[PDB]
Structure 1
Amino acid sequence: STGSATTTPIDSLDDAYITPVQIGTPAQTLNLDFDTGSSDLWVFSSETTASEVDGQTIYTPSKSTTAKLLSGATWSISYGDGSSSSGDVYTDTVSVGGLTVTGQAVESAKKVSSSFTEDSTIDGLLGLAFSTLNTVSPTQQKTFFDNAKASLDSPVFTADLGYHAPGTYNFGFIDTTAYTGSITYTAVSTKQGFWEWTSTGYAVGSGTFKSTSIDGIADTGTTLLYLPATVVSAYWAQVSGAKSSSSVGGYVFPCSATLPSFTFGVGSARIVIPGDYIDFGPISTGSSSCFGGIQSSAGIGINIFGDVALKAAFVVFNGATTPTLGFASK
């Protein structure tokens, strides 16, 4: 079997992408953020603290004939950005673009931090990292992808994110019409529970390619590209007037400047991120300082290939016995 769903940016900056998901019987459609950096399927619900809901569509397990409370099961998660959520757990039927999984753990949020409340366009997250990162206690639960694996034509899912435009998440197949040239595959380490891989280097604009190992994760749930301080300094040195600002919490550049492209290595292949993709607009309304899409990972502890990098490529998340990541130009 296969699944295919459209993902659309939540705003004009591509801060996040939402994908419609059908939960329960009869179906309740929620727009979830597909996250390859986490492994919990959690949704805003009829149980969430009333004051912590601001415009989101809630999942109501009482109106679902296939919903079953997983007795005693609880979950709590904290993301790298200081945001968090927690609650109880249900099992229910979940479908993504025609691909159905019965008995999927659907984590019902009782408490959400303010970061989630203020994003009225995001009804929850669909974790696509490895199931070893799932926070359900005392019995760990499997991701949607792990549960669908047996039924899928091929154990793969593809991410094809648009730049200021809709994109696609495909499950169980590779669309040969969605990319150009060849797919270069690279090894994945699952030791930390992420889609961790090693990039073979970088180039800033039309400069020479620097061969160096950059270990990082393919994370659809992170907006920006977070790279080592050495790389990020070499990039922003090519932008006139760019500087690192402690007040803003990162690199800012004069909005009138034109940004060079950024190339990252995948084996012997090269993925070119256009300079426009690195522009994240004014730091505040009316400001002439703009926020950069390439930031230092020095304070995070891990390099992240977020939406900025992923949206420049067709990305294959191969969940075979030996998992691999594939990249093609599009």
Structure 2
Amino acid sequence: AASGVATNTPTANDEEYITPVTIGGTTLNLNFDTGSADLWVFSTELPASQQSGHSVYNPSATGKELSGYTWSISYGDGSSASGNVFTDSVTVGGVTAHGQAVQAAQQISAQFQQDTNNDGLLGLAFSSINTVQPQSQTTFFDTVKSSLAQPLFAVALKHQQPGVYDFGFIDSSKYTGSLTYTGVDNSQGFWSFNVDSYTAGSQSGDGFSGIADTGTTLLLLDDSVVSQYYSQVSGAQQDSNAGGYVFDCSTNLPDFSVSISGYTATVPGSLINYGPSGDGSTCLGGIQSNSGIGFSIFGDIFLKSQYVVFDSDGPQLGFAPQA
């Protein structure tokens, strides 16, 4: 049976986490995203000026092209990418997927052309939302799941420290106590779960649902919740230059917690200070609006406080405080 550990590393301010992946012999730094199901990479099919600053995949060398297949993806932050498809060997933390579909970029939006920290994304959401056409393909995880010791992956994302992606096994030294599991609704292709209630510093409220997304930087919640939270932060104000609520970096922030199947997952106020807003001497809050979409995005801000198990049996998600 297989299992492996891939090490992730946060970029500046923990904006994103990158992990090396070897494709057909070439190592690329990818952003592992539990919010999507496409494995796409910068390739030699891109204009030479866009290959700059990146490690790129050369399909010609080792991939097998899927004639007539294309892919096109759009993310929540408005970025997008599109291209063609090849099958190749993909290795993550010593676990190799043979014949994995690799989406070679032909076009990338400005956000991607501006970010030299990654060379593409590896999606870990359910394969049901993979964008390959005419026939969708399976994610790296779905491709290898049957060969793992256990059909799950686990993640420990840290604040300005290397973290891990455990594939096929749980590392009990990564958390305190025992894990608590909750059921997942994969109907929209996400690792979606329910919270029974929340505590925002001195205020508590009713439950809601959200997705566990390693690919989103912040904790995105309903506007009501956001308001409630910053109403308790002396001098907090919205700053469009920064992207949301900002405050004095020295401010004492309240904790934020959610009740999940009887387990209280708490994000300490210190992790809610994202970092410099880069607009003077204010810091950006880790909690921001979800734009009225109807469900919350449990992004990296949240994940830095827990060890999370993504289990395909159920499916279910397990949580415990990071050790």
Shorter chain as denominator, the TM-score bin is over 0.9
Aligned to 1:216: 210
Q: Secondary structure at the match of 2:55?
A: coil
Structure 1 position 293, deviation (Å): 0.7
How many residue pairs get aligned? The number is 321
Which whole-Å CA distance do the structure 2 matches of 1:276 and 1:256 have between them? 10
Which whole-Å CA distance do the structure 2 matches of 1:110 and 1:230 have between them? 41
Matches within 5 A, 1:225-236: 225-236=219-230
Structure 1 position 225, deviation (Å): 0.3
Check the 8 A contact 1:52/1:114 in 2, yes or no: no
Q: Does 1:108 align with 2:89?
A: no
Which whole-Å CA distance do the structure 1 matches of 2:76 and 2:309 have between them? 24
Aligned to 1:34: 32
Deviation digits for residues 220-274 of structure 1, max 9, x if unmatched? 0000001112211111111100123455442111223122221122211112212
TM, length-normalised to structure 2? 0.96
**Percent of aligned pairs sharing the same letter:** 54
Matches within 5 A, 1:259-270: 259-270=253-264
Match of 2:73 among 48, 70, 77: 77
Q: Secondary structure at the match of 1:58?
A: coil
Q: Does 1:303 align with 2:288?
A: no
Which whole-Å CA distance do the structure 1 matches of 2:283 and 2:304 have between them? 20
Which whole-Å CA distance do the structure 1 matches of 2:268 and 2:48 have between them? 42
Matches within 5 A, 1:117-136: 117-136=113-132
Which whole-Å CA distance do the structure 2 matches of 1:98 and 1:227 have between them? 36
Deviation digits for residues 45-66 of structure 1, max 9, x if unmatched? 11112233330110112232xx
Aligned to 2:49: 51
Which whole-Å CA distance do the structure 2 matches of 1:224 and 1:173 have between them? 27
Q: Does 1:194 align with 2:190?
A: yes
**Ranges in structure 1 where 5+ consecutive residues have no aligned partner:** none
Check the 8 A contact 2:242/2:278 in 1, yes or no: no
**Ranges in structure 2 where 5+ consecutive residues have no aligned partner:** none
Check the 8 A contact 1:200/1:211 in 2, yes or no: no
TM, length-normalised to structure 1? 0.94
Q: Secondary structure at the match of 1:182?
A: coil
Q: Secondary structure at the match of 1:150?
A: helix
CA RMSD of aligned residues (A): 1.4
Aligned to 1:6: 7
Structure 1 position 298, deviation (Å): 3.3
Q: List structure 1 runs of 4+ shifted beyond 3 angstroms.
A: 245-249, 298-302
Which whole-Å CA distance do the structure 2 matches of 1:114 and 1:298 have between them? 22
Q: Secondary structure at the match of 1:106?
A: strand
